[PDB]
């Protein structure tokens, strides 16, 4: 064995505590680069002219922010979709003013998180598993691509990507509703049904299994000690759980197949979050939620307001106030 | 392999129809997103300069030029939010552009009526609209029945290219597991992890 | 939802944030547990469609907890090793999240909001160059209130003349 | 920033009090036979 064979055997080794693998040789440096630059920029970056209007927004903890208000601020609107690495700037001071760290973090992160998905295939291949855990992770990964990359591409600027911060996240959400009426888009509604349903089915599957645990312990001990790692028998009574849940609703609404149950647990949140990602990614090209503004009209022609018109009044207030110095012309076209 | 290839091509076509006004001409497909934002800035430069404004020297609220400003490499570009779209190139705009960008002398003198008609038409046919095809911003009232073909073509092909990437991952993982022989699950009599040493 | 943003600043509330973590965590747990089981299944039959290889009366586990544990320990660093704790944690996460969100709404019943950060308001009021995403969101909140209140609250008989309306430039 | 004067001790005790409660319970578990 030469050094390359010895190296390939180490990289793909199933005995490493964290699996490296070929996707990992990309995942490891990119995520480390994205993490290190994130922590530094979150702590100590100077303010960033995100809207390209010489109006820098303070994102870091050292410049006034707390954990909630802090953010790595998206790059300048003057940059747009232009690639802005450090070596494009005339100085680090210029790079920091124009929101350089944001581009470095999101590009490294999206590259690394894509390789995290490939690493999930890779280990399942090395362990002899079935390969589709990485398909389930494609749901949050697509969402990350939607808010960090796809939405900037459609709108023409990385200044419109989701900021790397808690309050900046809320700013992204409110502005997005103002411009796209995302609540009235069915892909976000399918997304909500995914996460509400996912949380419901998480609590449902958790409670039903916990409800049907076979008595293996006394009263003075945790029931979790009734399960031993790697035991062959199942630790709960699925027939009793089906007998309960099939009587809570009706018999044919309840799963008696654990494989069908667990596939449904995978499929419901993943498909919904896939649809939520396609919500953002197609509102990136300005195909917006449903507009029923002034849809109900009386016999004379008077507008009869609905709840959709009330939503519009809130959307108008977000619209007229967002980026309050950035618009010179009467339409916000991107 | 074809699924990954098709997903990659669908993402490419999504960007083709969104940005390119050469093989998707704006007379047939409508203005691009960048085009209409550039066309609004052109419309309000033309109107205000007709009212007597000196558009080269007009300061916006931020101190950047209200109509014209510099790109980060110094080309003269349209001001406002449309600074992000200064890479837009279209046949109605390129006559006004000199060696260093938008020419102030050309802007004062040589804007033809066909350009003014094109700028107003493209600004009012911006690719923004609702799923029920109400044209314009999300806050617009019902009247205009418009969603640009570029928006329909880009959004459809983003959805298709995304699900085709999912299909690529699904079939590529399944083909590996099927060729290696564990696509139906783990053999209980020779489970692979059971003959690996513990991680700790 | 939009009322609670514009009036209560409900996204800034840590009880809502704990609810968001419970819901999105529970959806993560729903997706991750279902995928892991379905991808660590034991070959218990010859079909390529693997649902038939489960029998509802079998004593044996249909998937490999040991293989699932090794996968996640190497991918992610940690992994469940106790199936009972795993399924309790799937109860706990969205249930605790929803309970946490309920407490924050009980505060909003009295307008006890997490509306502001006082230290940022003191600094922003004296330093007109100090801007965060938090001060940006409050401008959005002020827009929401002035633009929606006359029709959303038609018992108040709000007449806000157009010149009183907060607006940015142009729009 | 003009932050709450009690915020530092409120945070420090919010960490340290239940953290040391868990440390006490864990270490006495390990010392059991």
């Amino acid at each position: 064995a030469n050094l390359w064979e010895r190296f390939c055997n180490w990289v793909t080794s199933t005995d490493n505590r964290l699996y490296v693998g070929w996707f990992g040789v990309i995942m490891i440096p990119t995520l480390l680069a994205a993490t290190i630059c994130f922590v530094i920029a979150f702590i100590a970056a100077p303010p960033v002219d995100i809207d390209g209007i010489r109006e820098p927004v303070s994102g870091s903890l050292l410049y006034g922010n707390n954990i909630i208000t802090g953010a790595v601020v998206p790059s300048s609107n003057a940059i747009g979709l232009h690639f802005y690495p450090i070596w494009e700037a005339a100085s680090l001071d210029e790079w920091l003013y124009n929101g350089g760290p944001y581009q470095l973090i999101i590009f490294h992160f999206l590259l690394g998180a894509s390789c995290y998905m490939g690493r999930q295939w890779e280990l399942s291949y090395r362990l002899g598993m079935r390969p589709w855990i990485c398909v389930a992770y494609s749901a949050p990964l697509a969402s990350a691509f939607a808010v960090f990359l796809i939405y900037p591409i459609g709108q023409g600027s990385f200044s419109d990507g989701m900021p790397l911060g808690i309050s900046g996240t809320f700013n992204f959400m409110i502005v997005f509703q103002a411009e796209h009426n995302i609540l009235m888009h069915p892909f976000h509604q399918l997304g909500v049904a995914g996460v509400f349903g996912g949380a419901l089915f998480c609590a449902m599957h958790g409670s039903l299994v916990t409800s049907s645990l076979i008595r293996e312990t006394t009263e003075t001990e945790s029931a979790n000690y009734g399960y031993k790692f790697g035991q062959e028998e199942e630790t709960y009574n699925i027939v009793a759980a089906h007998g309960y849940f099939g009587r809570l609703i009706f018999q044919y609404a309840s799963f008696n197949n654990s494989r069908s149950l667990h596939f449904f647990l995978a499929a419901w949140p993943v498909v919904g979050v896939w649809f939520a990602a396609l919500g953002i990614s197609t509102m990136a090209f300005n195909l917006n939620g449903f507009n029923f503004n002034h849809s109900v009209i009386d016999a004379k022609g008077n507008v009869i307001n609905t709840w959709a018109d009330i939503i519009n009044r809130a959307n108008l207030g977000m619209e007229v106030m967002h980026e309050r110095n950035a618009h010179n012309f009467p339409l916000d076209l991107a | 392999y074809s699924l990954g290839a098709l997903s990659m091509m669908g993402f490419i076509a999504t960007c083709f129809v969104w940005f390119n006004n050469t093989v998707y001409p704006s007379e047939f497909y409508g203005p691009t997103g960048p085009e209409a934002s550039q066309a609004q800035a052109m419309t309000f430069l033309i109107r205000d300069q007709k009212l007597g404004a000196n558009v080269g020297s007009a300061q916006g609220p931020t101190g950047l030029g209200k109509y014209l400003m510099r790109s980060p490499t110094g080309e003269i570009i349209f001001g406002g939010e449309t600074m992000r779209f200064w890479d837009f190139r279209g046949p109605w705009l390129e006559p006004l552009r000199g060696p260093n960008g938008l020419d102030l002398n050309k802007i004062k003198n040589d804007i033809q009526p066909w350009q003014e008609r094109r700028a107003a038409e493209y600004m009012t046919h911006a690719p923004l609209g609702s799923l029920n095809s109400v044209g314009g911003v999300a806050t617009e009232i019902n009247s205009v029945n418009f969603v640009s073909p570029r928006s329909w073509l880009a959004t459809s092909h983003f959805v298709l290219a995304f699900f085709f990437l999912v299909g690529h991952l699904w079939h590529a993982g399944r083909a590996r597991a099927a060729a290696a022989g564990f696509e139906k699950g783990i053999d209980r009599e020779s489970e692979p992890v059971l003959s690996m040493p513990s991680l700790d | 939802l939009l009322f609670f943003q514009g009036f209560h600043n409900w996204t800034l509330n840590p009880f809502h944030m704990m609810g968001v973590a419970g819901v999105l965590g529970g959806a993560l747990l729903c997706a991750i547990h279902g995928a892991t089981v379905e991808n660590t299944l034991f070959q218990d039959g010859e079909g390529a469609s693997t649902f038939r290889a489960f029998n509802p009366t079998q004593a044996e586990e249909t998937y490999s907890m040991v293989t699932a544990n090794r996968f996640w320990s190497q991918i992610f660093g940690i992994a469940f090793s106790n199936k009972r704790w795993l399924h309790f944690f799937m109860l706990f996460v969205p249930v605790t999240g929803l309970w946490m969100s309920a407490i924050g709404v009980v505060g909003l019943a009295l307008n006890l909001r997490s509306y502001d950060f006082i230290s940022q308001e003191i600094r922003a009021a004296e330093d007109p160059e100090f801007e965060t995403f938090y001060t940006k969101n409050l401008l959005l909140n002020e827009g929401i209130r002035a633009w929606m209140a006359p029709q959303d609250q038609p018992h108040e008989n709000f007449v806000f003349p157009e010149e009183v309306l907060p607006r940015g430039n142009a729009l | 920033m003009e932050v709450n004067q009690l915020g530092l001790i409120a945070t420090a005790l919010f960490v340290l009090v239940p953290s040391v409660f868990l440390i006490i319970l864990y270490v006495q578990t390990e010392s059991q036979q």
Binding site: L18, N66, G230, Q231 | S198 | - | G7, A12
Partner: peptide, 30 residues
């Protein structure tokens, strides 16, 4: 003190990650 506090808690979380991964109670097949 605020910035110190937030960074301190963050550093303790990252330290906790280290012990939770590398000094976990080892899962034992029995």
């Amino acid at each position: 003190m605020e910035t110190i506090t937030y960074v301190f808690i963050f550093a303790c979380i990252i330290a906790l990650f280290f012990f939770a991964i590398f000094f976990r109670e080892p899962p034992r097949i029995t």
